[PDB]
Design an enzyme around this catalytic site. Structure first.
Site, short mmCIF file in Angstrom:
data_model
loop_
_atom_site.label_atom_id
_atom_site.label_comp_id
_atom_site.label_asym_id
_atom_site.label_seq_id
_atom_site.Cartn_x
_atom_site.Cartn_y
_atom_site.Cartn_z
N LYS B 76 8.75 68.04 44.20
CA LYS B 76 8.97 69.17 45.08
C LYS B 76 9.09 70.49 44.31
O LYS B 76 8.55 71.51 44.75
CB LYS B 76 10.20 68.93 45.94
N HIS B 108 25.41 59.68 41.55
CA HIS B 108 25.42 58.45 42.35
C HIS B 108 26.76 58.25 43.02
O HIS B 108 27.78 58.59 42.43
CB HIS B 108 25.25 57.20 41.44
#
Lengths: 122, 122, 116
Positions: B76, B108
């Site tokens: 992106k 995470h």
């Protein structure tokens, strides 16, 4: 003001909160989205895609406000920040004096957006 | 100059692009459990070697999910196959990509992985 | 070194429940996480859910800053200037943003190199 980056912003939004409010007040759309964004919102054939689009736009505008500095950003109407998509579908915002970088991500339950405001001049 | 609409050519931006990606770990788990061969389409050889050496299954899936998010965020920001994007560790994550300085960060939780990437042109 | 404008970036996402559990179990750890200034804000919240939220945002910020730098958590003072979160660290212009939902807190940091 020697820095080349003016500020950065990030916002995480629970889809269920946006869905709840849209269901409780449909005119929520008119309060967050520009006319151009509303056109897009009304053009989605699938309701879940509408809510995701709205959530992404809300997160983007919140991120944009945070990048400006909330003290100033809270004075900008959502209706006045048009997050449009370029020919490749990338989200964009034009704002005089900056180069605005935007990225949006969606999961089933969350939408998030990032904004980096780069200064256009020294 | 030269009368071209080429955006890269005309750009005065210091940042080439930004990307963020949020991934639900359960989706990666599902994908891996019902199609292990796709790991070969997402991870480089070095990444696969690391993936394969994990003793704990949950840490294995976390690594995969984090790499998936990173490659999407990178893609992106860039505006290139996932298995040709080698995100290695210094233990800081990094991507070498000719022509650019690539900044990456990964995070995470139990249920989500996210990554952000910022590209500067060399 | 490099001619790069940015030194590093960092992001951290944290589950609020985990921070809630941390505070319930070991309330003394807060002084190892929060600076004295941050503890003042933390202690001033009259609503329990909002002080855990504040703690979670500060933990994520310290984690993100640490990742960007590549410093003790209670030596990383994140204060609010227009309400924008800021950290002072010599050599850099530290850009920060924090976001909260009911279940998660997150923070992102970009360390811009100062042309002193």
């Amino acid at each position: 003001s020697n820095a080349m980056i003016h500020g950065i912003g990030v916002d995480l939004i629970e889809i269920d909160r946006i869905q709840a409010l849209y269901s409780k007040q449909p005119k929520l759309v008119e309060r967050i989205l520009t006319k151009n964004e509303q056109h897009k919102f009304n053009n989605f054939t699938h309701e879940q895609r509408k809510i995701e689009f709205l959530a992404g736009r809300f997160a983007t505008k919140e991120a944009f406000s945070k990048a400006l500095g909330t003290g100033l950003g809270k004075h900008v109407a959502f209706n006045d920040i048009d997050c449009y998509n370029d020919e490749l579908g990338k989200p964009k915002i034009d704002y005089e004096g900056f180069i605005v970088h935007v990225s949006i991500s969606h999961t089933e339950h969350y939408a998030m957006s990032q904004v980096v405001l780069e200064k256009s001049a020294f």
